[PDB]
Amino acid sequence: MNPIILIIILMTVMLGTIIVMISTHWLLIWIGFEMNMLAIIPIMMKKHNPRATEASTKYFLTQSTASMLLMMAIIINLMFSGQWTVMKLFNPMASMLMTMALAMKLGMAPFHFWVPEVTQGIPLSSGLILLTWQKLAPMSVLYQILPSINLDLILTLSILSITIGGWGGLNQTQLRKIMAYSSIAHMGWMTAVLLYNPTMTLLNLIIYIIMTSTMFTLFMANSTTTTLSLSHTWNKAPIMTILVLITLLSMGGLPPLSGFMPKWMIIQEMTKNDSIILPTLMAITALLNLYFYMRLTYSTALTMFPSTNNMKMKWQFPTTKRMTLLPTMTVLSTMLLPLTPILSILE
Amino acid sequence: MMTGRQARAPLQFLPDEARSLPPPKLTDPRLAYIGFLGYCSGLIDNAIRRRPVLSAGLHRQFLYITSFVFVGYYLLKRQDYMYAVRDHDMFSYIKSHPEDFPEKDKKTYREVFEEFHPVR
Amino acid sequence: PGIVELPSLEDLKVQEVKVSSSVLKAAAHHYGAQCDKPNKEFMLCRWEEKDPRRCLEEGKLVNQCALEFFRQIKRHCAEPFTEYWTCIDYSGLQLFRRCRKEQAQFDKCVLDKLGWVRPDLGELSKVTKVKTDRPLPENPYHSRARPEPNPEVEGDLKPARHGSRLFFWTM
Amino acid sequence: MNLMITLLTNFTLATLLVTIAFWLPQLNVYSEKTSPDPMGSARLPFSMKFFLVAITFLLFDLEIALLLPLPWASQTTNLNTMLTMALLLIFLLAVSLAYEWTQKGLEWTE
Amino acid sequence: VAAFLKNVWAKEPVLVASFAIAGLAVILPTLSPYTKYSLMINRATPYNYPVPLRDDGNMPDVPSHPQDPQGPSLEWLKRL
Amino acid sequence: IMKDVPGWKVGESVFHTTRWVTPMMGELYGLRTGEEILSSTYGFIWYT
Amino acid sequence: MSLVYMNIMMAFTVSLTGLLMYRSHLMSSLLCLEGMMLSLFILATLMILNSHFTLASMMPIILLVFAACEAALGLSLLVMVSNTYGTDYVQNLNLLQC
Amino acid sequence: MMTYIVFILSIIFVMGFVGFSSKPSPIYGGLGLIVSGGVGCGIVLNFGGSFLGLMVFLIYLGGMMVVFGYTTAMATEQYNKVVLGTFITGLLMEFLMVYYVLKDKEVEIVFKFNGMGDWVIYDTGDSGFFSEEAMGIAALYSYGTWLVIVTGWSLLIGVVVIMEITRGN
Amino acid sequence: PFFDVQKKLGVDLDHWMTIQSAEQPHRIPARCHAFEKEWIECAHGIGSIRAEKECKIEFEDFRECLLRQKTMKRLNAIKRQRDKLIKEGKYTPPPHHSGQEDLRP
Amino acid sequence: AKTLLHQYWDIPEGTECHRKTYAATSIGGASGLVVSAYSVALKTPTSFLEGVARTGRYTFTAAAIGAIFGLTSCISAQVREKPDDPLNYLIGGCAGGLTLGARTRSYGIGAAACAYMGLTAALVKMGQLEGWKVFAEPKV
16 A cells, blocks of 8 residues: 555545534534545555455445444434434434444444454554544544433443453453453443443543553554464563553553543442442453453463574564554553543543 | 533633633642653653663653643643632532522531440 | 414405416516506515415505506507517417517507506616505514523632542642 | 326337237247357456446546536526536546546556 | 647647646636626526515615616626 | 314314414315316426 | 335335345345435435425435445455455355454 | 325335345346336435436436446356245235225324325425525535535545555555 | 534534525525524523423424424314215215316416 | 333232232243344254244243242242342242253252342342332433
């Protein structure tokens, strides 16, 4: 791919997301979603492998069904309201259709089946672009329509996403599938608090974006795709293993790291509304996310798996990858707890 | 929650009313913590590229500290502004609606009765 | 809800203008030039009242005055107008450019027998003013009282009392 | 009602002619033929060029659909904006054509 | 520059003619003094009804009759 | 027609307001013949 | 609501159920998706032309063009699948189960 | 029975959908989609949308379904119970809705549907010397500057994406 | 988040197409201009909760103009009762509803 | 799925065992139908009759669970003469767990199902008594 064409395609993705974010018309939301899908399709086809083609086909079919359901919801709201302003919807059927459309777009369970599939078949940079940038626009659309969101449906989707993400990440050996199931659990966390306080949804979105960016940047820097190469990383560079141990510690919500910051705040907005069973259940389920993070830290940094003879050659060459914002994202994702009230800038 | 408050002056990082509040001091503990975070990020940047951590790249570490302190100062100013906005809205809503917040008759302990549960 | 107020059949009875479309299109410019005041009064009443039932009498005046137009055609200029409206009536699109000589003869007869001047381009499409005696409807949409808005924000911004008040944080 | 009548008349004349052409010499008596082309045993290989010119036609057809209402749109009051948007649409069409030209898109079906 | 232009006029006259026509089409409306005539021709077409205004008492510019001297004129369109 | 049906008010508007509403085509040609309905609502579209 | 609204919504529903149950091919599912888009087009333009929404008449053409562009993209993906396994069967797209 | 013409057309429309929702073959599915597109163009023709109906004929049928069948001819090499079964099932439910809404004149599945003709909800006025839908589309350049910009950029990006992803290198 | 770029920058991108009572080409009015106008001038600036609990009358009127549920329900009742009395023989159509009216103009 | 729970809860505790047993059997049958539908969708059976057999097995197992739980809870609340007590629902939950063990033809699953289902049913009765909400309406 040409650098100019790749740059133009990336700005097209950014323009589509911005168009969804800044528009006050439903047709422009739909237009931005199609812009985003059409411009992100070739990034998944960067290597021209059969797995990339199948992943792009599955992503295309799921996004097409989601966009068509979104247009059906827009048309129903047009009929029953006579206007296009992006605000609360004026039909429960249109609200339900739009909610399941955005759940299919975000990868919420039980529409999650493409997320561990697709992320396995695409490169690491494209998977990072997916799992971080593609989740901004549907979360904005969910933010704007929360007066019409059914509570039962969104809480069912949240608990299903958290449980299925934990039980799915409990099994994998590949890193990309682990990050996919972790993403599913995290969006269950973010949507569980949406109807009570969306500022916590914004805070959890930002923290999840920083953590996923740090982990994917570490994986790109070490060129690791399975757990065994991540185990091998201890011989080549120990500082990378220390960084992935600290980041995986923070991703599990272990205090005093910054990953304790979102979910705890979420509990603080759900015991105010006298809902005690749900946050306790969600923390108990997120213990499984902590479990497979602990398994990864056991394999990587807390022990030393055996290495090979050719690794000695890799001792003679310094790394030359542009590890952009890796120290900043490592610091920001782990020592951000003593600046917890800064979330008030998102209110 | 505050979505209707910042609906007539949109996309303003720090509005005019934010200038009525005292700015944070340069010796703030939070500003010092953010500068320490910037220094730690500079040390990590030195470490992951196989450089002497405390020796190499003094200008890079200084730029890290300065950029972190700049961003943190602006973020802290916005945070105190929005907390002041929260308090102002709360007090205005309490003052505007006196019937929903009745003053309670604050009794002393000679009139109130508390059940005694012995430990034995 | 309410009962729709509807005028009786005696209020809707008037002597119609029983002519075809080509008859009206032949004498459209002179009808606009001569019968302007009741037409403009009726159209202003229709656009201000937003109700046909409140304008019926004004409409009757139109159906009077237009008739008083055509009678003056019948008394003096019957034959050139007959030829002109027949020539207009022949063509499918009722084009004015296909009947120039009959229009010239009809206009000459009208001018030298009644003193009517045909309007030029854009004269009929002007916006004019109307002096009328009926008062302006203060509530044409029948709108009820608007809801009272929320009280606005006022006063200077004091700093937050004891900082954020979020758990153990002092500021 | 006139257009539906004309469509039905054309359709019924077409199927009457097809039935006559397909069945009139069927009533004649003749002798049958056995069940048996250069590529009978070979499979059809895919060619990217025909699919490429098909999708190029589809995209240019969509931009033609966007460009179509110009005769109605020329009667507007914002003449500067209409002229700018029309010229921008045709310029983007020409830019797409030139970019397909430069990247060897129109090769061997030029 | 002149050698390049003669070269492309030798090899590809079709592209040269197309680019010349496109450049003329994109620079000529900004120079011809007849665009404003198109604008007020499109403005002067009466698609809707000219609904009259209620006479408050002081409107000297608006006419009282279609044949009155007040209001806009159309002699320029009649002559051009 | 509705002298027998109980609880029916003749001429009851379906709108809460007293403003004049332009009559829908079914409100005008509801009780007329089929050919009048066809000429009124499809005469312009079906005219060649 | 009107009768044609029921018929168009039922058409959208049966095309959605046709999409969600793959039989053998992928071209058939793509055709079902374009049928869904066509039903959306018809419903939107019926609602728009019924209520005399003048400006909104610009909308369904866009609803065509964008979605039609998407259809082209889908076709290309199918061709890529046809370049790998020689057929557009959906039972060859299972390389990512492990 | 003439006054239900649009409704009658709508039946064929949903019937055509069961032509390709059962998915017999891409050629027969394309034929069913062609019939459904023609019927839908007739439906929007009966509502006054002449330009949009000819958009359906010019761009959907002659533009996009041509490419769909053209790519179909490069696959599904030439030479069931389930296809006929779901066709019969869908036809039976469709005629059940037809019979019920022609019987009791008011049904419901998700929304309340009325059993009268389509002619009732029409407008009694006249549009004047222009077609309202025609000027609504014609306002694409005068009013829809942003829509034109994003659509043109989308089509250009789509051309780039299409010729990029099928290179294979 | 909904970043109001348009209101901050003063530009207009899609506000002209959001509602139905907006400015139209040749000032063509929609069939429910007045109802939606009244609903909009009610619900302006009072919030969604007060909008949905305070002028439900205007929103019901606008929805009735949009979909005409009660109008065709009343038409169904009238036509059904007319058909029943026609079958029972106690009613006949007048000559002006049969096609011999020699209408108004 | 809200009318089934409503028709189960509107019967007072320990009054009519037949209606409570029927309501709990209907709720269990609905849950088993959902589980069987997801099982035959996600994991395709090798034959149509195999799919019908699996659907019937899941539906009958869950219906037996519901019937045994409702019957045992109502009988215990009748014979122990206290309707507002979570111990009755704990006994019913352990009876349902023993039914699960009898259906799956094992003992350890039966014991674990007794313990956890008795705890869950006692929690459900406690939430019904104290008005605990899992899908709480946002009031702050």
